């Protein structure tokens, strides 16, 4: 599969010169390509998109087409991220049928399964889990799709995640578990199903607060009483 370094996962329309340069450098090692002068592609990412494959070919008689098609590949990863967010089930099909890597990542570590579980698109989450989307991938803040699905209240999505291997005791960079965010947003039934599949109700975050305490600070006392 294909995975940009952390500094290149942004949309290429947003790349600077140096990003474009870092991308060329990166591509040269990954795919095992002959070293070229980056001043050939002397332009920011917004201009790179305007180039034709021939323009790629004549700049790099030895790797121009591969870089053109490589670029095209990452570009579909963004349209897949977008197709999984807006709920565009058809667009998710065409892109996965044209080769979309179902574990792409943007600048925020979001995968297409993160966005489809955070926004409530049950069909996309299932067709992503069926074609190999990582169920326990964590973004740069550590939020898993079960974090996003439990923080937003999507019960049928929290349950489908638990059915394919979603970790119920995953800790984020701030220490929060899926039972913490379900308590933060007042979703008792998700706290129920989380507590059914093995959620450590006594998990502590980096400030020392439990699911009871988050239910206290946010105003969910009926939930705070059920955890007590």
Residue numbers in the entry: 13 to 240
Sentences from the paper on this structure:
TELSAM is a pH-dependent, polymer-forming protein crystallization chaperone which, when covalently fused to a protein of interest, forms a stable, well-ordered crystal lattice. A point mutation of the TELSAM motif causes it to be soluble at pH ⪆ 8 and to polymerize into well-ordered helical polymers at pH ⪅ 8. Target proteins can be genetically fused to TELSAM, which promotes crystallization by ordering many copies of the target protein along ordered TELSAM polymers, which associate to form the crystal. To address these challenges, we designed multiple constructs with several types of linkers—rigid (helical fusion), semi-flexible (Pro-Alan), and flexible (poly-Gly)—of varying lengths to fuse a designed ankyrin repeat protein (DARPin) to the TELSAM C-terminus.
